[PDB]
Design a protein around this ligand. Structure first.
Ligand SMILES: [Ca+2]
Ligand SMILES: [Ca+2]
Length: 122
């Protein structure tokens, strides 16, 4: 569920998913195409690929079980979908943290029109 994913982002980066990551670069937020602009933007690209692999799961609304086991976001046991969706979310949240150093505010609100290039492959 996006609201849980949102919580992970805040927990991992200290920032709010909105608007810091809802419209960043070419892949963060709705849509996505062209090539990732930077580390951060790549995190979003991969997450998309991740969700792409779950063709039959309600990736955005399915509520899963997870928890901060010793300051570590750990996915709980549920259905294949929940466990899979949670992992995508888990990895993305942390990828954002690892890329905080190259986070560019100039990429926040990046026009999708400026993302014209052969969109990358998963
Ligand atoms: Ca996207
Ligand atoms: Ca559920």
């Amino acid at each position: 569920n996006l609201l849980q994913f949102n919580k992970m982002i805040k927990e991992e980066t200290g920032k709010n998913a909105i608007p810091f990551y809802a419209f960043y670069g070419c892949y963060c937020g709705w849509g996505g195409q062209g090539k990732p602009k930077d580390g951060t933007d790549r995190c979003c690209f991969v997450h998309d690929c991740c969700y792409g692999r779950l063709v039959n799961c309600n990736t955005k609304s399915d509520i899963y079980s997870y928890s901060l086991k010793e300051g570590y976001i750990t996915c709980g046991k549920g259905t294949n979908c929940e466990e899979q969706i949670c992992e995508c979310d888990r990895v993305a949240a942390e990828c954002f943290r690892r890329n905080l150093d190259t986070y560019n505010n100039g990429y926040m609100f990046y026009r999708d029109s400026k993302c014209t290039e052969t969109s990358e492959e998963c």
